[PDB]
């Protein structure tokens, strides 16, 4: 197993994992969506609502705001999550648009990760007061508790023999999108680190002159989040859940016979 980090942007990462196989990566992938826990607003207690929207819609939006989840403070790999409750209150008054950065928290560590989200517009004399409650939850129970995304693809190499008329266009096309090309005295090697749309001019030679071979055991991943957890950390937390999950199984096996 050896990695090769291609690019690290603010709250996203793309890398190339090697030395695993098809089964294991899906265990990894599915776990990031459905297991890694975050914080999200569970219920809302309204005190007064003279705004232009119904009670449920505003209540619904409060649950969608991504909240910073400090991973060094409880246990995010535990099978029995902690029931620690945070109270998000707000008292606002029109005119003006209510932003996400106005929410007050009862604990300085859990605040909205992105402060520019419009919640609801208030006109003259319309008061709006509420106390949102946040708890921990998992993605499989409700989609508001999702840390992010995982997409993976087979890493393939395309051999394009120089007998094909106008092979140069492929070189020109590949360079425009940024794919590593190595050239020699027979053909060009194109590494498909991203989607490669072949033009119709070449579809009649698909097979003969041009053939694609899969590299066994090398996957390109794309992980992106929303600001609740650092993207460097998601994979770390994910693997620990996997390990912890399997271990229990052995303990249950002995208690059967």
């Amino acid at each position: 197993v050896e990695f090769k980090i291609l690019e690290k942007r603010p709250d996203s990462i793309k890398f190339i994992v090697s030395g695993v196989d098809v089964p294991f990566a899906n265990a990894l992938r599915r776990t990031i969506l459905s297991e890694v826990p975050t914080f999200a607003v569970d219920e809302v207690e309204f005190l007064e609502n003279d705004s232009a929207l119904f009670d449920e819609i505003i209540a619904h939006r409060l649950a969608m705001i991504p909240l910073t989840t400090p991973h060094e403070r409880f246990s995010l790999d535990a099978l029995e999550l902690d029931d620690y409750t945070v109270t998000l209150s707000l008292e606002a008054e029109g005119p003006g648009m209510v932003y996400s950065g106005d929410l007050k928290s009862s604990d300085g560590d859990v605040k909205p990760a992105n402060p520019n989200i419009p919640i609801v517009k208030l006109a003259e004399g319309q008061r709006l007061t509420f106390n949102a409650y946040a708890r921990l939850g998992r993605g499989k129970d409700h989609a508001k508790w999702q840390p992010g995304f995982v997409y993976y693809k087979y890493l393939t190499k395309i051999h394009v023999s120089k007998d094909v008329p106008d092979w140069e266009e492929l070189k020109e096309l590949a360079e425009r999108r940024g794919l590593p090309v190595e050239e020699s005295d027979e053909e060009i090697v194109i590494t498909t680190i991203k989607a490669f749309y072949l033009p119709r001019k070449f579809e009649e030679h698909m097979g003969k002159g041009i053939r694609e071979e899969i590299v066994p055991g090398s996957f390109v991943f794309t992980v992106e989040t929303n600001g609740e957890l650092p993207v460097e950390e998601i994979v770390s937390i994910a693997l620990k859940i996997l390990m912890r999950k399997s271990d229990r199984f052995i303990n249950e096996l002995h208690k059967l016979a």
Partner: protein, 65 residues
């Protein structure tokens, strides 16, 4: 009906880039680069931002006490 704060397929915040989009496109700046200039890669996130109507300003005027 103020812009959906998440997309409907790809989980990614989107309300924070609606307004800044709209005023810039209503001055002549071609949409096919404004969207590209912001963090909008796939097209699934893009459909929800392009086609939307934000009727909330008309309805707000009328009242129910």
């Amino acid at each position: 009906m103020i812009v959906p704060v998440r997309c409907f397929t790809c989980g990614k915040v989107l309300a924070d880039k609606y307004y800044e989009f709209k005023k810039r496109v209503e001055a002549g700046e071609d949409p096919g680069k404004v969207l590209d200039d912001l963090g909008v890669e796939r097209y699934c996130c893009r459909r929800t931002l392009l086609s939307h109507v934000e009727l909330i300003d008309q309805v707000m005027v009328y009242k129910v006490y």
